[PDB]
Design a protein around this ligand. Structure first.
Ligand SMILES: [Mg+2]
Ligand SMILES: [Mg+2]
Ligand SMILES: [Mg+2]
Ligand SMILES: [Mg+2]
Ligand SMILES: [Mg+2]
Ligand SMILES: [Mg+2]
Ligand SMILES: [Mg+2]
Ligand SMILES: [Mg+2]
Ligand SMILES: [Mg+2]
Ligand SMILES: [Mg+2]
Ligand SMILES: [Mg+2]
Ligand SMILES: [Mg+2]
Ligand SMILES: [Mg+2]
Ligand SMILES: [Mg+2]
Ligand SMILES: [Mg+2]
Ligand SMILES: [Mg+2]
Ligand SMILES: [Mg+2]
Ligand SMILES: [Mg+2]
Ligand SMILES: [Mg+2]
Ligand SMILES: [Mg+2]
Ligand SMILES: [Mg+2]
Ligand SMILES: [Mg+2]
Ligand SMILES: [Mg+2]
Ligand SMILES: [Mg+2]
Ligand SMILES: [Mg+2]
Ligand SMILES: [Mg+2]
Ligand SMILES: [Mg+2]
Ligand SMILES: [Mg+2]
Ligand SMILES: [Mg+2]
Ligand SMILES: [Mg+2]
Ligand SMILES: [Mg+2]
Ligand SMILES: [Mg+2]
Ligand SMILES: [Mg+2]
Ligand SMILES: [Mg+2]
Ligand SMILES: [Mg+2]
Ligand SMILES: [Mg+2]
Ligand SMILES: [Mg+2]
Ligand SMILES: [Mg+2]
Ligand SMILES: [Mg+2]
Ligand SMILES: [Mg+2]
Ligand SMILES: [Mg+2]
Ligand SMILES: [Mg+2]
Ligand SMILES: [Mg+2]
Ligand SMILES: [Mg+2]
Ligand SMILES: [Mg+2]
Ligand SMILES: [Mg+2]
Ligand SMILES: [Mg+2]
Lengths: 64, 144, 117, 201
RNA sequence: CGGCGAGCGAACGGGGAGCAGCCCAGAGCCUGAAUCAGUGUGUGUGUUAGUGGAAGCGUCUGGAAAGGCGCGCGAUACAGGGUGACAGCCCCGUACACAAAAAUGCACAUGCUGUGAGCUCGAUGAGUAGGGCGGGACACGUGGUAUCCUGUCUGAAUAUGGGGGGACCAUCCUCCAAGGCUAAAUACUCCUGACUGACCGAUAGUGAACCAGUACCGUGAGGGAAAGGCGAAAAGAACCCCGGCGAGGGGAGUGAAAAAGAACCUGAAACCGUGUACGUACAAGCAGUGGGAGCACGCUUAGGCGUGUGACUGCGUACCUUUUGUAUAAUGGGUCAGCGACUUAUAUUCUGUAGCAAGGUUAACCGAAUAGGGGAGCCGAAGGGAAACCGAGUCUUAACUGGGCGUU
RNA sequence: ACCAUGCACCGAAGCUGCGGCAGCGACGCGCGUUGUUGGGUAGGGGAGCGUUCUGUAAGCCUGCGAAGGUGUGCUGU
RNA sequence: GCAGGUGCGAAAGCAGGUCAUAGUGAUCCGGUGGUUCUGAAUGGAAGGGCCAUCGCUCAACGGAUAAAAGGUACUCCGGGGA
């Protein structure tokens, strides 16, 4: 039968132009008063999935 | 040429692996599975994304975004598709008739992709700056 | 496409058993034992093609030593003297001569002695 | 391209792309193998351990008897047990790209011309549905194993050919790559030649 | 949707198969008028027995010819089966052409018969819709949750009225619940016929090729085997002999063959004997291997050689598995034969190969079509952004000297 | 026996010699030249043998003896 | 270092917390404010997104549940001379 997408993965990764995946940074959900403005600022933009984790992400998202 | 003189192209018919048929094959006695453990077992192996129990990548990262329903009914049209509309005028219905956009598309945008060589009238579509310049250089017209 | 194994399996077992002729008891009769016997015979033969060269050189040397001592010189001095005389006859031929042509071997000893002193 | 008739000794001019192309052996081989795979019925089965008749009782207790542990009388290890990977009915047919099929046919027809195995005639018919008449006709033209392709299927010719095992009579639209290769000679009417032309564009 | 985990998973819309619409909640008027059921009768097809159905000889081998060789003949019949080896022409069939006293399927047709058409006026399903509580169903786990069903308590409008459009309101659109019937496309196969298989071929294939759901086991539910082949034909061995008026055997006879004799085709291996050659009763161990005398038999040069044996002598602790590591006194195997473990379907990615190429390719289905049709779709030629949106750019920010992802 | 000095020799599947096979690379037309390499578990890569079945095959072999069984000789890594 | 706005200094300048190195908790689910980005016929709305922020001795501190102690000499299986 058709492979089933890991739905939670589809809610956290989007495929980019050259086949990589973008994701939102962790650590910007809650307790934030104690975190420096610089640290939170650098967590705001999306980042690319690293080479080690690309295999896991690709396995989870066959239909990306 | 006969039914007994026809051969496949070289390199097109690689033989399949056959595990467990003796020492000489290179795949005897463990079938390439190595020694024991979960992965050596029939049916063995862990699910996709599993990392051994550590909070896996697809869960330690946050969800983001929402899905636009409008995006699903919006298409893009290349300049190379302008000629393929038979009738000289490019609009939603003529684009659909030529199989350029989907039947349920309601909004469409012409972009600078490919090249246009004929005077065409674009009607009811959005057009990017570059695509508009290209169409108008080709003698075309853009009507809203 | 069911395949019956009988003809091929019998051919294989018969090949091994033919290689096991002369062996004792089950080793010449029973495929499980015979196969191991044939494998081990092969291992021994591979080893002993090297060993055979060792053993024959050892035998030639012992015979040369005997014949040389019959002519008044030890093996080691005899070989050194032959080397100093530029005599390149090897020990297989030297052993053969020591057994079959004792006058010629005496001549070789005299040559070795003249080279030595 | 020029195809010279046998009985009327005129020439029918034909597409070079159809009847004069290079022989593509790998493509023809793929299409011929696909045709053979398409002829398979694939009707068979064996019984897994689930489908062998018998009960699920454990043949003997897990420990203490001194025997190897048994769980099912239907184990494939056992005599009368299931077949480990028991077969099921199968569909062996393969896809052939339309263009791949047509390219194979063109390669075959061109190779037939190159081998002098395609014979074009203006007409090929029989007076009556009589096997003897067609056998005589074929003896006259020195054909024994021959695929006869006509513009439209005939009744008398089809009946006359039926009892000749080295002979097959086809409509132009009923050609197949394997038949074109399998018979020593292919005899095609000029009407059939045009029809095959328009079939392969 | 989802301890937003594992998983579950639509709809709208599009292409196809098939297509069919009607009654009651009632009175006129008309009437019986389509349909519709039984029931006739015919009329056609089936079905259930059947009939005819072409064309070959000689010679060779052989136990036997259908095989070889030679020369013929039929074929709308060279499907298939049989016959002493392989038969178009020997036989049964096969193509083709025919056939029913009787029963019966269906399909027409018009007779009896009940159900009653078209028509105007009118009517338009209430403890129901909806609600409160508890559950359940919807892809949808109560969630912001529409909609459906209802165990419990309630409870309307009713056409100027009412339901729905995914909380909810307004506006618009669309439909008419609380009565009912309805063919086809769809599902299946205990059972019957015909035909087919890159399905099995006696440990396989059904458990069962054979008097098998039997023998046998169990109180019972229930469980559940093993076991096929003489020969072309029984011509299945008259008769004689040893033997207990035995068993068994030796002859004789049949047969191509009885070393096909019924304990029967072929007749492997483990295992057990008889015969011959060589070795072996002062000799220590994975039993072989390297060296090697002697003996016996045999070879076209008369020479050594070939075959078998193997005194004596160097070296030498099986195999598998598991382990850091096993001669290990760790595992497993008494031996042989037969069987016994990486498959299959679908989706997805990569490699090779083939086709076509900024295009590629169709699915269901249609079609007698492995053709042809069918482009519904899917993937690709554009990305950025959460998104609106912009677009070879875009996002970030008030804005980039910029930076991220893209563009060549 | 031990210390010291020295020259001989024995000694491995190390090295050399002779014959042969194969991998890889450089250089010339699958051939050659030349350099080099070839212990191996898990494991990855490459290339093959044989078995049953389908086409080729209404062909070919076969009662002047098929398959199977049992010997013998030749032959390839 | 760049843009905006700022403090101290006459000025050159210094300042994006503290001499530095511990003082901490992913994701989910939700809460609060801001922001028409989205808004299932349409206008709104709900809900969602985005930005800021809040709720864990999840301390077994990469946190398996929102939610969990014992007995077996009545014992049982798969394994290890790890
Ligand atoms: Mg937040
Ligand atoms: Mg290996
Ligand atoms: Mg193991
Ligand atoms: Mg381990
Ligand atoms: Mg492992
Ligand atoms: Mg399992
Ligand atoms: Mg389309
Ligand atoms: Mg078979
Ligand atoms: Mg024996
Ligand atoms: Mg079975
Ligand atoms: Mg097609
Ligand atoms: Mg007849
Ligand atoms: Mg016979
Ligand atoms: Mg109503
Ligand atoms: Mg209700
Ligand atoms: Mg409600
Ligand atoms: Mg309702
Ligand atoms: Mg509503
Ligand atoms: Mg709405
Ligand atoms: Mg309307
Ligand atoms: Mg059976
Ligand atoms: Mg048998
Ligand atoms: Mg008797
Ligand atoms: Mg027979
Ligand atoms: Mg027998
Ligand atoms: Mg003795
Ligand atoms: Mg003694
Ligand atoms: Mg020893
Ligand atoms: Mg240990
Ligand atoms: Mg050891
Ligand atoms: Mg012991
Ligand atoms: Mg042991
Ligand atoms: Mg044991
Ligand atoms: Mg895009
Ligand atoms: Mg050496
Ligand atoms: Mg070496
Ligand atoms: Mg080496
Ligand atoms: Mg190696
Ligand atoms: Mg075959
Ligand atoms: Mg301080
Ligand atoms: Mg400090
Ligand atoms: Mg709305
Ligand atoms: Mg931890
Ligand atoms: Mg944990
Ligand atoms: Mg235990
Ligand atoms: Mg153990
Ligand atoms: Mg220990």
């Amino acid at each position: 039968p058709k492979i089933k997408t890991v739905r939670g993965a589809a809610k956290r990764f989007k495929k980019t132009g050259k086949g990589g995946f973008k994701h939102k940074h962790a650590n910007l959900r809650h307790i934030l008063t104690k975190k420096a403005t610089k640290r939170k600022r650098h967590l705001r933009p999306k980042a690319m999935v690293s080479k080690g984790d690309l295999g896991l992400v690709i396995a989870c998202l066959p239909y990306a | 040429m006969r039914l007994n003189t026809l051969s496949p192209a070289e390199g097109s018919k690689k033989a399949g692996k056959r595990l467990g048929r003796g020492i000489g094959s290179g795949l005897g006695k463990t079938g390439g599975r190595g020694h024991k453990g979960q992965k050596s077992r029939s049916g063995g192996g862990v699910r996709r994304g599993f990392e051994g129990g550590q909070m896996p990548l697809y869960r330690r990262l946050p969800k983001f975004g929402f899905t636009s329903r409008k995006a699903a009914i919006t298409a893009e049209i290349r300049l190379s598709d302008l000629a393929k509309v038979e009738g000289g005028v490019v609009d939603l219905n003529t684009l659909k008739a030529a199989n350029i956009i989907g039947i349920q598309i309601e909004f469409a945008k012409v972009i600078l992709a490919g090249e246009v060589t004929t005077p065409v009238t674009v009607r009811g579509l959005r057009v990017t700056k570059g695509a508009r310049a290209a169409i108008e250089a080709a003698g075309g017209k853009i009507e809203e | 496409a069911r395949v019956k194994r009988g003809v091929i399996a019998r051919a294989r077992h018969k090949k091994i058993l033919k290689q096991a002729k002369g062996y004792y008891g089950a080793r010449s009769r029973v495929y499980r034992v015979a196969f191991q016997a044939v494998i081990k015979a092969g291992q021994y033969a591979y080893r002993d093609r090297r060993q055979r060269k060792r053993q024959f050189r050892q035998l030639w040397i012992a015979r040369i030593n005997a014949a040389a001592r019959q002519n008044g010189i030890s093996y080691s001095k005899f070989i050194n003297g032959l080397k100093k005389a530029s005599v390149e006859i090897d020990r297989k031929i030297l052993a053969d001569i020591a057994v079959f042509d004792k006058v010629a071997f005496t001549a070789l000893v005299e040559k070795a002695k003249a080279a030595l002193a | 391209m020029e195809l010279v008739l046998k009985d009327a000794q005129s020439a029918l001019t034909v597409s070079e792309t159809t009847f004069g192309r290079d022989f593509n052996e790998a493509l023809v081989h793929q299409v011929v193998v696909a045709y053979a795979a398409g002829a398979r019925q694939g009707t068979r089965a064996q019984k897994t351990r689930a489908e062998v008749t018998g009960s699920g009782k454990k043949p003997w207790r897990q420990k203490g008897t001194g025997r190897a542990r048994s769980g099912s009388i239907k184990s494939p290890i056992w005599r009368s047990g299931g077949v480990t990977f028991a077969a099921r009915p199968q569909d062996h047919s393969q896809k052939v790209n339309k263009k791949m099929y047509r390219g194979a046919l063109k390669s075959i027809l061109s190779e037939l011309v190159r081998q002098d195995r395609l014979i074009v005639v203006e007409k090929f018919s029989v007076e009556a549905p009589k096997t003897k008449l067609l056998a005589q006709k074929l003896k006259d033209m020195a054909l024994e194993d021959v695929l006869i392709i006509t513009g439209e299927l005939d009744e008398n010719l089809f009946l006359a050919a039926r009892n000749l095992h080295k002979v097959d009579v086809r409509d132009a639209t009923g050609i197949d790559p394997v038949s074109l290769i399998a018979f020593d000679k292919v005899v095609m009417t000029a009407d059939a030649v045009k029809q095959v032309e328009e079939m392969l564009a």
